[PDB]
Design a binder for this molecule. Structure first.
Ligand SMILES: COc1ccccc1C(N)=O
Lengths: 237, 300
């Protein structure tokens, strides 16, 4: 059933599972036409499919050509997401296929369940957690590969860099969701935090800066301040 | 006109015959029902005065044999039976018509209600849903589960309705997932009508039988089946025009006949609001939408 604060450690057990977030699949800019009407222009999107235990991120880039000539794109986008996740599962060896897929938005349940009828043993689950995966496009290297794609493409990342060498997957996921929550609440501030000190760099094969354990504690504290702050500037407290 | 005689009425019981019903007191001199119209299936049904639990009854067609009811004090119910001996049955029934010990099937001449509720229902198809092949009539009660219910526990006592499941490999063609889920015409027309039911008359027959078992016995799995068969049609963009017109008439008479006080349990709010107001056929059921809106505006 649904995933929530009570069964949170289940994410880091040894049953293969994936989170699927569809919030960046169908992306548009809204603009005025010469006649003074409004139109949309689609831009490249991505499916965010993440193993929370290992950090493996299957980033399926959604090129705008997939929308050409199609109607009801917000609905199609959920079914396209489900088709691509299904194709991903089918491409994995049996022993790498997930036992559970957790969708971050409940409108993905039926599209994914229907595309996975062939996999009766894979549980499709919602969640009550408000996860900040929409902010994935605030990670510069992920945004860059999506916007440069000229065709459909799958790119594989580890969203934890090398963190699992030093911390558990529970702690790495907590760090990831704090970073992403901050980027979602105030992107400018969050990004200022992560890069202010020019001596801390991002390795070519990484997404985030190479912080020492001590510097991560500083960083993490500065993100909780930001999130609390913005919650002030928002609600006035 | 045919007759369903009774040996006796040893226990107080409300007896239904199709959409009619009457009370019989314990050991009252009741010996059955006469003037039953030939040409239709019928249902004779029972609710004991001491235990409203278990409504039960028998589907039958008098063209298929001579049937009578006898109370079994061991199993505690009124049982339908068949008499092979015609001459004896005629001779025993006549004795009763002479002593005026029978109630008359009370059909008003203007009234087509029973025809309109059973137009496509045939005994041969009832007997495939209700498997008990040594009898020409079929027993149904409030508690019997359907084959699909048993998949989600006695198989001999099941209602073998056609399984309908919108998220099933039968319903959804590989590669047409979105198309087939959002527009069920493939499942309705190819899988169910051409494949399983063969024609729409057989589909409507099962739909009508499911409704009648829901209404007369409060059979929950039959109610599920009735709504699923409605929803499969309403959720199909492509339906033969004659089928939509006939469905409108079928449902109209079902909604007309439904007890006003059972609407809360016998009508599924989601299915009806979807069918009448969101589905492909939202504008194709004029008679049904008008009676629903005037009789059950709360549900909507
Ligand atoms: C003659 O048919 C019967 C056979 C046994 C008992 C009663 C009946 C009857 N018709 O009521």
């Amino acid at each position: 059933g649904a995933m929530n604060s009570s069964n949170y450690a289940e994410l880091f057990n040894n049953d293969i599972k994936l989170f699927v977030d569809d919030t960046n699949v169908y992306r548009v800019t809204v603009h005025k036409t010469f006649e003074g009407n409004v139109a949309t222009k689609a831009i490249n999107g991505c499916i965010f499919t993440l193993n929370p235990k290992t950090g493996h991120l299957f980033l399926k880039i959604i090129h705008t050509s997939v929308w050409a000539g199609q109607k009801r794109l917000s609905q199609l986008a959920k079914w396209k997401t489900a088709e691509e996740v299904s194709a991903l599962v089918r491409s994995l060896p049996k022993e790498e296929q997930p036992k559970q897929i957790i969708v971050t938005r409940k409108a993905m349940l039926d599209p994914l369940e229907v595309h996975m009828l062939d996999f009766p043993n894979i549980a499709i689950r919602p969640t009550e957690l408000r996860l900040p995966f929409s902010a994935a496009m605030s990670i510069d290297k992920l945004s860059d590969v999506v916007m440069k794609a000229t065709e459909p493409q799958m790119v594989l990342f580890n969203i934890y860099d090398d963190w699992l060498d030093r911390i558990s997957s529970y702690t790495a996921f907590s760090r990831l969701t704090l970073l992403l929550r901050a980027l979602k609440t105030n992107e400018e501030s969050a990004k200022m935090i992560l890069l202010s000190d020019p001596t801390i760099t991002i390795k070519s094969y990484h997404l985030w800066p190479s912080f020492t354990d001590e510097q991560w504690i500083t960083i993490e504290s500065q993100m909780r301040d930001l999130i609390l702050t913005e919650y002030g500037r928002k609600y006035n407290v | 006109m045919n007759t369903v005689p009774f040996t006796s009425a040893p226990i107080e019981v409300t007896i239904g015959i199709d959409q009619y019903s009457f009370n019989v007191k314990e050991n009252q001199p009741f010996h059955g029902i006469k003037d039953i119209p030939i040409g239709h299936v019928h249902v004779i049904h029972f609710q004991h005065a001491d235990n409203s639990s278990m409504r039960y009854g028998y589907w039958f067609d008098c063209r298929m044999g001579n049937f009578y009811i006898q109370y079994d004090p061991k199993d505690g119910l009124y049982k339908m039976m068949e008499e092979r001996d015609g001459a004896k049955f005629e001779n025993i029934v006549h004795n009763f018509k002479e002593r005026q010990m029978m109630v008359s099937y009370p059909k008003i001449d203007e009234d087509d209600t029973w025809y309109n509720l059973t137009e496509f229902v045939q005994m041969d198809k009832i007997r495939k849903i209700v498997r008990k092949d040594e009898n020409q009539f079929s027993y149904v009660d409030s508690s019997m589960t359907t084959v699909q219910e048993n998949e989600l526990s006695d198989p001999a006592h099941s209602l073998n309705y056609t399984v309908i499941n919108f998220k099933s490999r039968e319903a959804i063609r590989p590669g047409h997932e979105m198309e087939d889920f959002l527009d069920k015409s493939y499942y309705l027309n190819t899988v169910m009508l051409q494949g399983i039911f063969k024609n729409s008359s057989n589909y409507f027959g099962e739909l009508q039988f499911a409704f009648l078992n829901a209404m007369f016995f409060g059979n929950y799995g039959s109610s599920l089946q009735w709504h699923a068969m409605i929803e499969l049609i309403c959720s199909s963009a492509t339906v033969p025009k004659h089928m939509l017109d006939k469905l409108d008439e079928i449902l109209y008479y079902q909604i007309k006949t439904l007890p006003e006080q059972y609407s809360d349990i016998l009508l599924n709010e989601r299915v009806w609001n979807i069918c009448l107001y969101s589905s492909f056929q939202k504008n194709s059921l004029h008679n049904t939408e008008k009676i629903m809106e005037n009789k059950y505006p709360e549900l909507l």
